[PDB]
């Protein structure tokens, strides 16, 4: 029982039958030619050796036929005619099938060899040239602090030719193995016992995100089953699927395990944009590594914008020179001397504090969160050594030492359950209601289309740090049968309403007072390849262009809008007066620079930030969710829905959360800076007088025409202000 | 006479290094700067540093130059072994410089390798053992044997890697194209060199008496003529090692030729026929036409648009569509050559809208497939 495998059985049958038939045919021809024709008295004979017959038959089998040797007896020639009819077919079918069998061996077998002190990360799930090139371009980016971490890809496929090229260019630090995290032998080959983390990537563009999330959950279950203590970072497409992996016995967020839920994050960024009109661009640029690289054809606004895109958020230890400063002194000092924007600190168990007030001191070895162009910038805060050594005034020189009811956690406003018919409205009821400064959600859904989790949109808008009178009313325009199955998650939020019908009807839009809203959100639940990539956003594009064309004579292209794109290259249709170019990537396009467009592709590089500094991912999640703690995620995972009621003063104390607001230089106390002041003067003044921490500007593109504004992240200290600018601020009140 | 003076060097060099690996493995099995060097060497040969890109280009040039020196020796030489003092010949002088470079590059490679045992068995390690040590034996004696030197042709199989390390092959069909051509050519050139060694040396068990003085170029031709299964038999092998090599060659290379020729024809058959751009005459009007373009819709459109009963106007029709036109439509586009033009492209692409100069058209006409199954999808 030595041939066990059907291809090896088939291989030995092919080779042995082919060889024995060739050897026996050669022997028969040798008998005929050396004996000669019997009816010619054996006189007609030709003294070939067996080896000449064996060669001659291979030369005719293959149809080469040199004719250096050939048969001459008449039985020899008739045997050659019979041999040609039989053996050409055998050779022509043998040679292909042996090539198929020997072509079947795996190219990327073998096992990872762990060097004496290099760290490594195992990466799996959706591995392709696109996902790998986008992953490595951020993970290995020059602006990161230099670390020897190897990336070990594990996947079932053979890599495509363009991916084999990419794996070769990174040869010294990227490795690839054929296998699956579903197999305990493959988990051993990549030494996942000894990895820092496993990263599990998702196919964001699949047809069925519940099926993709099921596959990824089974991979985490496999990795944890193999060894519980492995840090797993996973990408999830649906928020309801997070509950399943929160319930695995060995999933532990306190140890590093994490779920980058792209539906939660997507709707969180666009929800915070309804409150600060450009935040999703401000903020989504901080979480991808990019380096500012001018080109002389760029307009002023494009150079200002692109300088801002070179920023990222970094974690670093503050030097001992900061000890016993308040966070306001430490922030003035970082900004004015070090040219770094400090925005938060890890207070010692330990807790993140964003823009803490004068009550909070810098303790020894406080870790701070900075916005800066590169990790080489933030080191300056670790090396800053006061009067001892770091005395001099050009920053490049710092380099050496001192030689009503709420939810049960009080984080959100809350409402007892209701039937959807309490919040459903017809156009007359909606028009009778004086909706103004509200949020409009234009949802596009079929009744059967997947749940998008609008709770992640609405919940940030009901953050408990707002007073009830200043909560923006929200109205969803969309399919009712869809909203019935969405509603079970929404029914606990106050000031919500539904106008059932298509958002493309220009009546629903007028009834909703679309011209008076603070933000219109255009969102779709439709199948991500209902057809080819030109049709994929046609409803969202038509809805944008429809609203942009209406007339609200008691206008039209000045209704504020943010659209979520299923396919990034469709951003070109989303705006006119634009100068589109398909080779520009999304973040450089005018609709994204204006905060009018969003797409899930800008969230890809969150995976690597969860690996490099998990706390930075909790910082952004506390901002974008409006304060969703792991206790609330735990409570939601009990399946009871969001429990709430009246709250004690001790939990209600958390209503003083820091938030990102936006303020105008046109009037009030800061207006003095609008008349030709500089951003550094404004920054220091506002931090000192108000504890406001300014993080960027929102400026008109047309400095003279259109209402389009673009976002500048963290301007230089000497940057000139305009009286029409708006300032992004972290604030407590 | 001294062919073995060289086969020795080549083979013996390989064995002593292999033994030193086996005893090192066994000593360490019975009983940091290394990794910094291994990573630096890996980054260097992968073309990641600027000095890496330089070295990798030098490998591209000097692998080809080393092959050209072998063609010069294979062409202009008579006997397989040959007496000529090393101090006399400029070709063998410059060949020492290349053999030194490939010796340095071999050690670079070794430093970079993960498992030294497997490295000592890589194909390019054998190319180096059979090429360089004999090129030094040819200094110690003033004679040379053109033995396994044909293996220099295998160094061409590094070219698809160099053109990956240098990021110049970007497209998967162009990557596939260069892999096909370079592997096919180097396997043909190296096989021709091996047959030339066998026929010109003759059978060793017949005291080398059975020998046939083919040139390298006759072997190269003869192998193409048998690869393709033509087999003229104007040239053929006669030694018994020549004939056994031809039998092995027939079993391997008929499959390579029969799969290479189709796949090159698929790749070169892939270029777009109706690329290019519309050229706007000094005062002719034009109309861009797109959407459902087919022989039926175009013939019915042109029969009315260009009808003799209309007032005569010089308007050109510029069709823009994603397909290649069908044969009957190419006929119709040719009959109207002076006033109808066709471009491969889509109105969904801003570069294609520029090619048809739609800025300067009178109109764009967008035609519909009236007979589709789903008119909401067509609209
Ligand atoms: Ca940067
Ligand atoms: K033939
Ligand atoms: K033939
Ligand atoms: K023939
Ligand atoms: K012949
Ligand atoms: Mg390694
Ligand atoms: Mg013309």
Which residues sit opposite A557 in a β-bridge?
A: none
The number of beta carbons lying within 10 Å of the beta carbon of residue B25 is 12
CB under 8 Å to A117, separation ≥6 — which residues?
Answer: B32, B35
* Closest C-alpha to A164, from B187, B120, B163, B123: B163
Residues in a beta bridge with A200: A124, A234
Q: Please name the residues in contact with A535: beta carbons below 8 A apart, sequence gap of 6 or more.
A: B377
Report whether A67 contacts B235 (CB < 8 A).
Answer: no
Chain B contact for A582 (CB, 8 A cutoff): yes
A169 contacts: CB under 8 Å, gap ≥ 6: B46, B47, B48, B164, B165, B167
Q: How far apart are CA A679 and CA A423, in angstroms?
A: 45
Paired strand residues for A659: A731
> Residue A601: is it exposed, middle or buried by C-beta count within 10 angstroms (0-12/13-18/19+)?
buried
**Tokens 């009037």 found at:** A667
Helices marked H in A233-314 — which ranges?
A: 242-246, 262-272, 279-284, 300-309
Q: Which residue do the tokens 């011209």 mark?
A: A515
A155: β partners: A178
Give the H or E element holding residue A709: strand A709-713
The DSSP call for residue A574 is G
Query: Which tokens hold the place of A24?
Result: 């026996």
Contacts of residue A426, defined as CB under 8 A and 6 or more positions apart, other chains included, come to: A499
Q: What is the DSSP letter of A158?
A: P
Q: What DSSP designation does B154 have?
A: G
Distance CA B146, CA B152 (A): 12
What is the number of other CB atoms lying within 10 angstroms of the CB of residue B364?
Answer: 16
Would you say A276 and A661 are in contact if contact means Cβ atoms under 8 Å apart?
yes
Which of A63, A99, A168 is the closest to B161 by Cβ? A168
Contacts of residue A277, defined as CB under 8 A and 6 or more positions apart, other chains included, come to: A519, A560, A595, A662, A698, A709
* Distances in whole angstroms, Cα of residue A112 to Cα of each of A115, A152, A177, A189: 10, 8, 8, 6
Minimal Cα distance from B179: which residue of A?
Answer: A161
Tell me how many degrees the CA angle A338-A341-A342 measures, rounded to the nearest 5. Answer: 100
Q: Which helix (H) or strand (E) holds A111?
A: none
Whether A553 has a binding-site annotation, put simply, is no
Inter-chain contact A65–B231, Cβ cutoff 8 Å? yes
Do residues B266 and B176 make contact, with C-beta atoms less than 8 angstroms apart?
A: no
| Closest by Cα among A108, A152, A154, A96 to A127 | A154
Q: Which residue has the tokens 């009821």?
A: A429
CA distance B270 to B250: 31
Distances (CA, A) of B143 to A439, A532, A601, B100, B137: 91, 70, 67, 19, 9
**B114/A162 touch (CB, cutoff 8 Å), yes or no:** no
Beta bridge partners of A363: none
What's the A22 CA to ligand 3 centre distance in angstroms? 19
Helices (H), B202-280: 216-227, 240-268
Contacts of B248 (CB under 8 A, 6+ apart): none
Cα–Cα distance between A567 and A561 in angstroms, integer? 18
Question: Angle at CA A544, nearest 5°, toward A541 and A547?
Answer: 145
Contact of A129 with A157, CB cutoff 8 Å? no
The rounded distance, in Å, linking the Cα atoms of B148 and B80 is: 11
Calpha distance A260→A621 (Å, rounded): 10
Sign, CA dihedral A329-A332-A336-A341, equals positive
Q: How big is chain B, counted in residues?
A: 379
B/e letters for B119-135, b = 16+ CB within 10 Å, e = fewer, are bbeeebbbbbbbbbbbb
Question: Is the alpha carbon torsion for A657, A661, A666, A670 positive or negative?
Answer: positive
User: For residue A327, which of A305, A352, A291, A303 has the smallest C-alpha distance?
Assistant: A352
Judge whether A344 and A352 are in contact, CB under 8 Å: yes
In angstroms, the CA A368 to CA A347 distance is 9
Distance, CA of A696 to CA of A279 (rounded, Å)? 10
d(CA B339, CA B310): 15
How many Cα neighbours within 13 Å face the side chain of A499? 29
β-pair type (A597-599, A561-565): parallel
Q: Which ligand is nearest to the CA of A113?
A: 6
Q: How many CB atoms lie within 10 A of CB A691?
A: 20
Residue A525 to residue A485: CA distance in whole angstroms: 13
Structure tokens at B260: 């290479």
Q: Could you tell me the two tokens for A194?
A: 């000894």
| CA separation for the pair B340, B299 (Å, rounded) | 12
**A167 is written with which tokens?**
């794996």
**Residue B333 CA from chain centroid, whole number:** 38
* 3-state SS, residue B34: helix
Residue with tokens 């250096």: A68
| Cα A353 to Cα B210: distance, rounded to the nearest angstrom | 91
List all residues 6 or more positions away from A681 whose beta carbon is below 8 Å from its beta carbon: A673
For residue A186, say whether it is annotated as part of any ligand binding site.
no
Distance between CA B295 and CA B278 in Å, rounded? 21
A534 contact B CB<8A: yes
CB of B319 within 8 A of CB of B287?
no
Q: How far apart are the first and last CA of chain B?
A: 85
Cα separation values, A383 from A183, A376, A378, A388, A616, Å:
47, 11, 9, 11, 22
Nearest to B242 by CA among B282, B296, B202, B187: B202
Q: Facing residues of B321 across strands? A: B344
| Bridge pairing between strands A341-347 and A231-236 | unpaired
C-alpha–C-alpha distance, residues A276 and A663, integer Å = 9
> What is the rounded distance in angstroms from the CA atom of residue A518 to the CA atom of residue A516?
7
CB A256 within 8 A of CB A229: no
A718 has binding-site annotation: no
- The radius of gyration of chain A's CA atoms, rounded to the nearest angstrom, is 34
Q: Residue by residue, what is the 3-state secondary structure of A591-647?
A: HHHCCCEEEHHHHCCHHHHHHHCHHHHHHHHHHHHCCCCHHHHHHHHCCCCCCEECC
Question: Between chain A and chain B, how many beta carbons pairs sit less than 8 Å apart?
Answer: 90
Based on its alpha-carbon atoms, the radius of gyration of chain B, rounded to whole angstroms, reads 31
Closest by alpha carbon to B144, among B131, B128, B127, B126?
A: B131
To test the contact with chain A by mutation, choose from B237, B251, B258, B378 the residue with the greatest count of A C-beta atoms within 10 A, namely B251
Cα(B68)–Cα(B60) distance, integer angstroms = 13
Q: Note whether A726 and A698 are within 8 A (CB).
A: yes
Rounded distance between C-alpha atoms, residue A584 and residue A557, angstroms: 25
How many residues can be counted in chain A? 733
- C-beta separation of B45 from A125 below 8 A: no
Report angle CA A197, A202, A206 to the nearest 5 degrees.
170
Nearest residue, CB atoms, A172 vs list B46, B175, B246: B46
CA atoms of A326 and A308, how far apart (whole Å): 28
Which of chain A's residues have a Cβ under 8 Å away from the Cβ of B247? 55, 58-59
Q: Check if B262 contacts A (Cβ < 8 Å).
A: no
CA pair distance A571, B60, nearest whole angstrom: 43
| Tokens representing residue A253 in the block | 């967020």
Task: Count Cβ neighbours within 10 Å for each residue of A355-391 and write b for 16 or more, e otherwise.
Answer: bbeeebbbeeebbbbbbbbbbebbbbbbbbbeeebbe
Neighbours of ion ligand 2 (CB under 5 A): A 63; B 229
Can you read off the two tokens belonging to residue A397?
């020189």
Listed in sequence order, the residues at least 6 apart from A41 whose beta carbon sits closer than 8 Å to its beta carbon are none
C-beta atoms of B175 and A161 within 8 A: yes
Instruction: Give the resolution value in Å.
Output: 3.1
Distance CA B348, CA B358 (A): 12
Q: Compute φ and ψ for A173, nearest 5 degrees.
A: -140, -5
Per-residue CA distances from A524 to A136, A139, A450, A485, A569 (Å): 30, 31, 10, 15, 16
Q: Where are the extended beta strands (E) located within A272-366? A: 312-317, 341-347, 351-354
| Residue A694: C-alpha distances to residues A699, B91, B112 (Å) | 14, 72, 50
Tell me the CB-side half-sphere exposure of residue A131, using CA atoms within 13 A. 19
Phi, psi of B262 (to 5 degrees): -60, -50
Q: After which residues is chain A broken (C to N over 2.5 A)?
A: 348, 403, 554, 704
Compute the distance between CA of residue A311 and CA of residue A285 in angstroms, rounded to an integer. Answer: 7
Q: Among partner residues B164, B226, B377, which is closest to A64 by beta-carbon distance?
A: B226
The position carrying tokens 């494009």 is A302
DSSP state of A474: E
The residue with tokens 């923006």 is A472
B228: helix, strand or coil: coil
A546 touches A505 (CB < 8 A): no
- Between CA A559 and CA A547 the distance in angstroms is 8
Residues of B in contact with A55 (CB under 8 A): 243-244, 246-247
Residue pair A313/A286 in contact (Cβ under 8 Å)? The answer is yes
Q: Which two tokens stand for residue B100?
A: 């030194």
CA distance A545 to A561: 11
Distances (CA, A) of B183 to A106, B178, B200: 20, 8, 26
Say how far apart CA B87 and CA A442 lie, in whole Å: 87
- Helix, strand or coil, per DSSP, at residue A152: strand
User: What's the rounded Cα separation, in Å, for the pair A265 and A285?
Assistant: 14
Distance between CA atoms of A465 and A646, rounded to whole angstroms?
15
**A372 Cβ neighbours under 8 A, 6+ residues apart:** A311, A312, A314, A340, A341, A378
Distance of CA B29 to the CA centre of its chain: 43
- Contact partners, residue B76, CB within 8 Å, separation at least 6: none
- From the list A60, A62, A84, the residue with the least C-alpha distance to A70 is A60
Contacts of A158 (CB under 8 A, 6+ apart): A107, A108, A178
Contact residues for A525 (Cβ-Cβ < 8 A; gap 6+): A443, A444, A445, A446, A449, A450, A451, A452, A482
Q: Are B9 and B137 in contact (CB under 8 A)?
A: yes
Q: How far is CA A74 from CA A60, A83, A211, A294, B219, in A?
A: 17, 14, 71, 85, 34
Q: Which of B320, B322, B317, B319 is nearest to B306 (CA)?
A: B317
Task: Copy the structure tokens of residue B67.
Answer: 């092959």
Alpha carbons A116 and A51: distance in angstroms, whole number: 58
Task: Give Cα A706 distance to the centre of its chain.
Answer: 32
Residue A505 neighbours by CB under 8 Å, 6+ apart:
none
- The continuous run of DSSP H or E covering A166 comes out as helix A161-169
| DSSP state, residue A335 | I
Q: First-to-last CA distance in chain A?
A: 80
Cβ atoms of B223 and B192 within 8 Å: the answer is yes
């Amino acid at each position: 029982n030595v041939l066990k495998t059907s291809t090896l059985i088939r291989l030995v049958q092919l080779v042995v039958s082919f060889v024995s038939l060739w050897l026996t045919a050669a022997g028969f021809l040798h008998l005929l030619e050396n004996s000669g024709d019997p009816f010619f008295d054996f006189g007609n004979a030709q003294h070939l050796t067996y080896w000449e017959c064996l060669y001659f038959l291979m030369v005719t089998m293959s149809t080469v036929g040199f004719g250096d040797i050939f048969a001459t007896t008449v039985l020899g020639r008739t045997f050659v005619v019979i041999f040609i009819m039989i053996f050409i077919g055998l050779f022509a079918s043998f040679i292909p099938e042996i090539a198929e069998i020997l072509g079947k061996r795996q190219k990327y077998g073998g096992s990872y060899k762990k060097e004496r002190g290099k760290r490594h990360v195992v990466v799996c799930g959706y591995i392709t040239f696109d996902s790998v090139s986008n992953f490595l371009k951020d993970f290995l980016h020059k602006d990161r602090e230099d670390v020897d971490v190897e990336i070990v890809f594990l996947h079932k496929g053979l890599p495509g030719l363009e991916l084999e090229g990419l794996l070769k260019r990174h040869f010294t630090q990227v490795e690839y193995f054929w296998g699956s995290v579903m197999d305990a032998n493959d988990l051993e080959r990549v030494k996942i016992q000894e990895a820092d983390a496993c990263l599990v990537l998702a196919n964001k563009y699949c047809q069925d995100p519940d099926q993709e999330d099921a596959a990824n959950i089974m991979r985490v279950i496999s990795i944890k089953n193999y060894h519980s203590d492995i840090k797993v970072i996973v990408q999830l497409l649906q928020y309801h699927n997070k509950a399943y992996l929160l319930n695995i016995p060995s999933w532990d967020w306190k140890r590093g395990d994490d779920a980058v839920c792209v539906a939660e994050l997507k709707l969180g960024f666009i929800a915070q944009s309804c409150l600060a009109p450009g935040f999703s661009t401000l903020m989504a640029n901080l979480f991808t590594m990019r380096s500012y690289k001018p080109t002389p054809e760029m307009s002023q606004w494009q150079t200002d914008y692109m300088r801002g895109t070179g920023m990222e958020m970094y974690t670093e230890y503050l030097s001992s020179a900061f000890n016993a400063l308040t966070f306001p002194e430490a922030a003035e000092l970082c900004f004015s001397k070090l040219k770094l924007l400090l925005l938060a600190i890890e207070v010692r168990e330990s807790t993140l504090a964003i823009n803490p007030g004068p009550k909070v001191k810098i303790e020894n070895a406080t870790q701070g969160f900075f916005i800066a162009e590169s990790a080489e910038e933030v080191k300056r805060a670790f090396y800053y050594c006061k009067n001892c050594h770091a005395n001099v005034s050009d920053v490049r020189q710092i380099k050496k030492c001192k030689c009503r009811k709420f939810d049960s956690t009080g984080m959100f406003h809350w409402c007892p359950d209701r039937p959807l018919n309490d919040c459903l409205q017809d156009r007359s009821q909606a028009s009778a209601s004086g909706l103004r400064n509200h949020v409009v959600v234009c949802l596009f859904a079929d009744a059967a289309s997947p749940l998008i989790g609008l709770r992640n949109l609405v919940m940030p808008l009901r953050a408990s740090n707002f007073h009830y009178h200043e909560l923006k009313p929200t109205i969803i325009v969309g399919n009712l049968d869809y909203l019935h199955r969405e509603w079970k998650t929404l029914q606990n939020f106050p000031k919500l309403s539904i106008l059932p019908g298509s958002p493309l009807n220009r009546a629903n839009l007028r009834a909703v007072n679309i011209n008076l809203c603070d933000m219109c959100v255009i969102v779709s639940a439709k199948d991500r390849n209902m057809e080819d990539p030109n049709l994929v956003d046609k409803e969202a594009i038509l809805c944008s262009l429809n609203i942009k064309a209406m007339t609200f004579d008691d206008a039209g292209a000045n209704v504020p809008l943010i659209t979520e794109l299923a396919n990034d290259s469709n951003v070109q249709f989303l705006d006119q007066d634009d100068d589109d170019d398909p080779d520009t990537e999304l973040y450089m396009t005018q609709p994204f620079a204006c905060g009018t467009a969003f797409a899930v592709s800008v969230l890809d590089s969150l995976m690597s930030t969860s690996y490099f500094n998990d706390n930075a991912l909790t910082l952004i999640r506390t901002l974008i969710t409006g304060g969703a703690t792991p206790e609330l995620e735990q409570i939601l995972a009990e399946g009871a829905g969001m429990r709430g009621g009246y709250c004690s003063p001790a939990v209600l104390a958390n209503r003083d959360r820091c938030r990102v607001a936006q303020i105008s230089l046109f009037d009030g106390p800061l207006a003095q800076f609008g008349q030709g002041g500089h951003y550094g003067e404004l920054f220091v003044y506002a931090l000192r007088h108000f504890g406001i921490l300014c993080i960027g500007l929102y400026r008109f593109r047309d400095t003279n025409p259109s209402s389009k504004r673009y976002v500048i992240t963290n301007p230089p200290e000497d940057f000139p202000l305009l009286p029409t600018d708006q300032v992004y601020v972290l604030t407590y009140k | 006479r001294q062919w073995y003076s060289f086969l020795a060097s080549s083979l013996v060099t390989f064995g002593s290094g292999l033994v030193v690996i086996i005893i090192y493995r066994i000593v360490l099995w019975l009983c940091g700067w290394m990794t910094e060097a291994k990573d630096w060497a890996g980054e260097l040969i992968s073309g990641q540093t600027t000095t890496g890109r330089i070295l990798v280009g030098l490998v591209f040039l000097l692998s080809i130059a080393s092959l050209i020196i072998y063609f010069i020796d294979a062409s202009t030489n008579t006997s397989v072994e040959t007496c000529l003092p090393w101090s006399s010949s400029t070709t063998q002088q410059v060949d020492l410089a290349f053999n030194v470079f490939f010796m340095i590059y071999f050690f670079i490679r070794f430093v970079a390798a993960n498992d030294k045992l497997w490295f000592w068995v890589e194909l390019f390690s054998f190319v180096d053992y059979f090429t360089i040590p004999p090129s030094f034996v040819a200094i110690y004696l003033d004679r040379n044997w053109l033995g396994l030197q044909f293996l220099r042709a295998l160094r061409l199989m590094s070219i698809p890697d160099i053109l990956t390390y240098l990021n110049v092959l970007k497209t998967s069909t162009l990557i596939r194209l260069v892999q096909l051509v370079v592997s096919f050519v180097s396997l043909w050139l190296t096989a021709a060199g091996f047959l030339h060694l066998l026929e010109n040396s003759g059978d060793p068990f017949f005291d080398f008496g059975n020998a046939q003085h083919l040139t390298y170029w006759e072997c190269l031709y003869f192998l193409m003529v048998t690869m393709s299964t033509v087999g003229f038999g104007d040239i053929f092998a006669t030694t018994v090692l020549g004939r056994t090599f031809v039998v092995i060659f027939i079993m391997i290379f008929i499959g390579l030729f029969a799969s290479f020729i189709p796949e090159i024809a698929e790749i070169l058959g892939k270029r777009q026929k109706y690329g290019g751009s519309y050229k706007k005459e000094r005062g002719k009007r034009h109309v861009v036409v797109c959407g459902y373009i087919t022989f039926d819709s175009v013939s019915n459109f042109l029969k009315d648009f260009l009808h003799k009963d209309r007032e005569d106007v010089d308007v050109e029709i510029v069709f823009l569509h994603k397909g290649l036109p069908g044969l009957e439509l190419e006929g119709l586009l040719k009959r109207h050559f002076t006033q109808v033009e066709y471009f491969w492209g889509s109105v969904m692409d801003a570069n294609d809208l520029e090619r048809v100069k739609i800025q300067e058209a009178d109109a764009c006409l967008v035609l519909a497939n009236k007979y589709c199954q789903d008119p909401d999808q067509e609209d």
